[PDB]
């Protein structure tokens, strides 16, 4: 009824999948060799470990899709392996949500290794006995069971998608907050030093009065942003603000030359000592690695987001062959992106697991 370019149907796609199959077998190959030469000492390494599996279960369905699509009984093994694939994909999606959570929790931190394995087994089993009826199969109980599983699967995606949205939203708000705090504090000090130069090269009392005002404000801002350390990180600020206040008085009284020299006293060795110490106390770096953590949301968005997003228009809202062909391609390519996950998961192991990257540095 409807015809498409076999250059794309029987060639491009089978090759695209062939790429994925190899690229995916090698990376997940040496991955599994690394992962069972690492003791499972946390939630994370454990969820990662399950990912290696569901990835190899994914790769091992590619050939049957490759040979079928390139036109090489022959049709029932297609229904089974595709079930195994769909099983595989929603497992990947489930663990990715857990990995998200697990990673999000370690970014709100300066009983497990046993419940983690159990939750894993729940994941698999609940997918398996949801994948069983589809490959168990006239009897029209099953083609309404398709609307059952298809429904479950939408919920599985959307819940884990929400998880991802929330966790990365909380991680983004925190990393932003952390950035602005440090950016401002650096600003504070930079203003202090900048308005001293202004003072140094100033004529009137108005120039001195203004720069000192900015300095006073910046200093007090710095002090606010720098609570004392639990171990003279409060008395120091009193000295610096003191000098600034003194210089301000001199500048208000009219004596600009004295003002400038009172200002200059921040350049004494002791005052600069104090400054360097107060600058020191201020910087306390402890933020989650940027392009390292976001890899997950990335992989999730590349692989799983499109297949589900693209469905909602033309699942919730035609005879012509271009529209039915547009749909074929959209579905088929999004499903390719889905499969790409088995190749993008090794990246998560690399960019986020210390021990993994070590074996990978070696073997
Ligand atoms: C726990 C795991 C258990 C194992 O899982 C399974 O066994 N699953 C059964 C198959 N299932 C699907 O998700 C099926 C795949 P298939 O149809 O069987 O190949 N997709 C659809 O049923 C479907 C329908 C649809 N429409 C409904 C009419 C409308 O006509 C206008 C089109 N559109 C799209 C769509 C997709 C991507 C992009 C654009 C559109 N998909 C996944 C879960
Ligand atoms: C389908 C409708 C009713 C919305 C339901 C969404 C549920 C399933 C999602 C949305 C936001 C999610 C939460 C987002 C963040 C956290 C904090 C983390 O420390 C543990 C998981 C937890 C608590 C998630 C659990 C699942 C959650 C509550």
From Swiss-Prot:
Described purpose of this protein according to its UniProt entry: Receptor for ADP and ATP coupled to G-proteins that inhibit the adenylyl cyclase second messenger system. Not activated by UDP and UTP. Required for normal platelet aggregation and blood coagulation.
The protein, known as = P2Y purinoceptor 12
The entry's localization annotation reads: Cell membrane
Give the membrane topology: Multi-pass membrane protein
Q: Which GO terms describe its molecular function?
A: G protein-coupled adenosine receptor activity; G protein-coupled ADP receptor activity; G protein-coupled purinergic nucleotide receptor activity; guanyl-nucleotide exchange factor activity
Residues annotated as binding ADP: 74, 78, 86, 131-134, 146, 150, 311-314, 331
Q: One short Pfam family name for this protein?
A: 7tm_1
Its domain of life reads Eukaryota
Q: What is known of its domains?
A: The transmembrane domain is composed of seven transmembrane helices; most of these are not strictly perpendicular to the plane of the membrane, but are tilted and/or kinked. Agonist binding promotes a conformation change in the extracellular loops that leads to an inward movement of the transmembrane helices. Antagonists such as AZD1283 can bind to an overlapping site, but block the inward movement of the transmembrane helices.
Q: So which disease is it linked with? A: Bleeding disorder, platelet-type, 8: A condition characterized by mild to moderate mucocutaneous bleeding, and excessive bleeding after surgery or trauma. The defect is due to severe impairment of platelet response to ADP resulting in defective platelet aggregation.
Q: Tell me, which GO biological process terms does this entry list?
A: adenylate cyclase-inhibiting G protein-coupled receptor signaling pathway; calcium-mediated signaling; cell projection organization; cellular response to ATP; cerebral cortex radial glia-guided migration; establishment of localization in cell; G protein-coupled receptor signaling pathway; hemostasis
Its tissue distribution reads: Highly expressed in the platelets, lower levels in the brain. Lowest levels in the lung, appendix, pituitary and adrenal gland. Expressed in the spinal cord and in the fetal brain.
Q: Which gene encodes it?
A: P2RY12
Please tell me the species this chain comes from.
Homo sapiens (Human)
Could you list which ranges are Extracellular topological domains? 68-78, 315-329
